[PDB]
Amino acid sequence: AQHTTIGDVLREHRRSHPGRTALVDGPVRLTWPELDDRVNRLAGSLAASGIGRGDRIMWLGQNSFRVYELIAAAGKLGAMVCVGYWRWAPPEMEFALRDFDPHLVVWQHQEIHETVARTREALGSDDTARWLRHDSAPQDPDGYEAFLAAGGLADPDLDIDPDSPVLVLYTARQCGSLLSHTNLIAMATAAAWLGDIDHTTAFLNSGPMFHIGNHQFWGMPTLLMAGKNVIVRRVVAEEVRDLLVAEECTHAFLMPPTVAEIVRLNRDTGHDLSRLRATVAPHLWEGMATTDTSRFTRSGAAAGRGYGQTELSGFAVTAAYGGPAAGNAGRPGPGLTVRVLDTAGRECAVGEAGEICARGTVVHRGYWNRDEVNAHRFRSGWWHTTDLGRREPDGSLTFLGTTTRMLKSAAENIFPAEVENCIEQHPAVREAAVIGVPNTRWAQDVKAVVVLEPDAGVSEQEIIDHCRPRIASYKKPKSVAFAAALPRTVSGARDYDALDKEYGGGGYP
Amino acid sequence: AQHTTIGDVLREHRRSHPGRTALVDGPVRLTWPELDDRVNRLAGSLAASGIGRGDRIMWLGQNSFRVYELIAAAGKLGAMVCVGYWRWAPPEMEFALRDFDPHLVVWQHQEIHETVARTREALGSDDTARWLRHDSAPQDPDGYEAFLAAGGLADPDLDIDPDSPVLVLYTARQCGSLLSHTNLIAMATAAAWLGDIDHTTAFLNSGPMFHIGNHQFWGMPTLLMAGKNVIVRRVVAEEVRDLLVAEECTHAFLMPPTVAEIVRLNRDTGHDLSRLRATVAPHLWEGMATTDTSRFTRSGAAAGRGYGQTELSGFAVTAAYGGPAAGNAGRPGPGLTVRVLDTAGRECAVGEAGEICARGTVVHRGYWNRDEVNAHRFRSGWWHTTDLGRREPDGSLTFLGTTTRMLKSAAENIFPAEVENCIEQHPAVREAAVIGVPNTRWAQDVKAVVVLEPDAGVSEQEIIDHCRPRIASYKKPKSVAFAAALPRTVSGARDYDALDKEYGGGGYP
Secondary structure, eight states: OOOOOHHHHHHHHHHHOTTSEEEEETTEEEEHHHHHHHHHHHHHHHHHTTOOTTOEEEEESSOOHHHHHHHHHHHHHTOEEEEOOTTOOHHHHHHHHHHHOOSEEEEOOTTTHHHHHHHHHHHGGGOOSEEEETTSOTTOTTBHHHHHHTSOSSOOOOOOOTTSEEEEEEEOOOEEEEEEHHHHHHHHHHHHHHHTOOTTOEEEEOSOTTSHHHIIIIIHHHHHTTOEEEEOSSOOHHHHHHHHHHTTOSEEOOOHHHHHHHHHHHTTSOOOOTTOEEOSSGGGGTTSSEEOOSHHHHTSGGGTOEEEEGGGTEEEEETTSSSOOSSTTBEEOTTOEEEEEOTTSOBOOTTOOEEEEEESTTSOOOBTTOHHHHHHHTGGGOEEEEEEEEEOTTSOEEEEEESSSOEEETTEEEOHHHHHHHHTTSTTEEEEEEEEEEETTTEEEEEEEEEEOTTOOOOHHHHHHHHTTTSOGGGSOSEEEEOSSOOBOTTSOBOHHHHHHHHTOOOOO | OOOOOHHHHHHHHHHHOTTSEEEEETTEEEEHHHHHHHHHHHHHHHHHTTOOTTOEEEEESSOOHHHHHHHHHHHHHTOEEEEOOTTOOHHHHHHHHHHHOOSEEEEOOTTTHHHHHHHHHHHGGGOOSEEEETTSOTTOTTBHHHHHHTSOSSOOOOOOOTTSEEEEEEEOOOEEEEEEHHHHHHHHHHHHHHHTOOTTOEEEEOSOTTSHHHIIIIIHHHHHTTOEEEEOSSOOHHHHHHHHHHTTOSEEOOOHHHHHHHHHHHTTSOOOOTTOEEOSSGGGGTTSSEEOOSHHHHTSGGGTOEEEEGGGTEEEEETTSSSOOSSTTBEEOTTEEEEEEOTTSOBOOTTOOEEEEEEETTSOOOBTTOHHHHHHHTGGGOEEEEEEEEEOTTSOEEEEEESSSOEEETTEEEOHHHHHHHHHTSTTEEEEEEEEEEETTTEEEEEEEEEEOTTOOOOHHHHHHHHTTTSOGGGSOSEEEEOSSOOBOTTSOBOHHHHHHHHTOOOOO
């Protein structure tokens, strides 16, 4: 009664914004009343099929307007939706289905049908969920639309606890982070402030919904403020350009490579993209889009000056909160308190690296089906991020890296990320990776693999002496190797296993 | 763990903003760590004196920085503070003390000591609270400062439920509206979006803290965003002008008569008030202050285009939410859903007047010690405002007046405020009051008392026939009396008893 849920957002919008367009996806266009009507029918069918409080629905597909519908329908029943990774190969898909154990699976035939069939065959006699094909013929009795059309118009009208999860997002051993109605609304509210979002926002949903990013910037704040969410299935520069114009989009999730592709296509065509408020790499648009002047962009937050993770409902610490910041992440937004805690659970001094810990409204509810990990990661009433950081003297925060990589050299635990960050402050260094190499007396020594800027020179020694004045002696590398670039995985992440193989790594705890 | 309280705000600010000024009150200046330290000491002494979850503290004084300290200290203990009306005469002060039944009273000697002594005398042997004089000599053992100085620096560190009340404000039969941590933070968060408030905001607290206004715009959002709150005890034009300059205030609570005093006082002095962002009557500043360009001002909300009450944590419906609005109040802010309900609890159609009802995060917890009224005003899971309104076709809302004035003509309940609003739409009418006059057959007939614009003419019949096309026939006035202005009370409120006396009113239900 004194607590807003996602259901409450739609019920209010259908009354306050009867004529406004809420969702667009290909030829589908829905006003707030039309969306809320569909949500009600869908919730009606879900309830008749036995879905209620705590029940679970998995989405296996690319972006679609139906993801918003399911989140809201589920939300009106106190159920939850996992937006799964559509690229999962059969082993990972099987693992996610077995872990999350959905009562219903809404799947996409286009692009992934072979993987889906293989996975269902792999599940064998454990495949007991209902499966609804979302991109079906509209009359397909095993399809989403026919399931929805059999529902009635009445609102279920249940008292749903807003702390109950509604969106589940898998994060990398994969774990499902449980985001409540409260988490999402606090995130969206904070984001509306950051980005100056309102009912005139028109956001192109070109980021993956299996990640928190697209929801934060700006799927959910647009929904909260009654603006227009335009969906695209894949990112094809020509199609994106046409949607930016035809839907008069003010915001979109567009990374630099896609930006440059769009810009090249649009050069000298006269198609007008000036309504778009570019947050990422504004300069690359070459004046074709307007540079965003919201706090999000002006502060540097949009260029990466912040810290977050799914479990904090996204990018929850930024340089937009609280002014100039010495630390690379800025400060926590409202509804978040952050402490840097040492190994004993005590608060670190200024300058000292420790684990970033959090309390507040954007902290998730835990992982799905991880009782032990949850008990441990919430110990002493703080959420433990497994990310390493420090407070600066001005009060702001620096994010250093993960705590999940660790060296143990004799008695001492050493966090590579701390040493990496230290070496990366040298102006001659582009990037550094730190590994441990065996030492028969005390398990490990520290080794750095360093990638220099092309126009700079430093030696093994200058980089060791560079470490002396701000990291503890026992953390300095015993040797430095120089490389043209770091090895990376097919996904473009640092390849630590390949580092260990090339440079003699081992002896880890 | 996943819920922010007022205590969490200060704990975070002490870490993120170690050098910023939080409060200024005369010579008192407090950074966030200094404020949080005082709060902790104060909480220490409160707890040692027995104050804990659900306990109550009454403030009987003018504005002071200690009000923020008390609210925060109380909040760290799960206790609550009533900011009482310092002008209460002894009967009303006694009523409030007996009703709220505080364990502790923090009182002011200046200006009101005689009233306070009379009231304590009146309470006789029921005066069992601790009384602490806030404006005492610093060492006064019955004073606030000595009580606080005896507390230790440690943070009490309790797990406080944010739905628990922390601020209590009396609303006129007086009733104490209970505002939770959540209510205040949701109000402050929405206000920060409305007014573009951040850590650089410096707000002069020149509105009375016994009313929600000063808290909403902009005491609490400023606190939330870590800006600077400057306190003044009373509003003297010269002192306000000097504080606006010396503290470089960006915002202040200043009504038009005070604005014109300040303006005349400052004319050709060269004192620079340009940092001030005028929200109310910006034209009246004559270029000496900057006209605010936040949504709050641009939308008309600051000039009165909205609707709210204490029990909705203030001005909760405004023209700033959701764009142009045909209705005089706009639309609900996020975390608020509004329905116009008829007498039977059913939702009114578009255009039909009924009671404004609300669910959501800004809805208060109820009144203190009003079990029956609370059960009734929360019936069917909606908070009932006792304010009358309607939805317009565009989805926006119109506020018509109160439902507490009612006529009953034969079988029909008639709301004077609906008829008043209708008559006030005529361009020749400045203001209209509607009363009931006795009718021996069916109890009451409708009568209008109408105040014309100085430059217009209309007759009794124009005004009756004016009503025909909107309101129902039985609601039209049977007679109209014209008046030079409406009688008002010493507080400047409409004087309905004097209307009844003058124009033969009676026969009410």
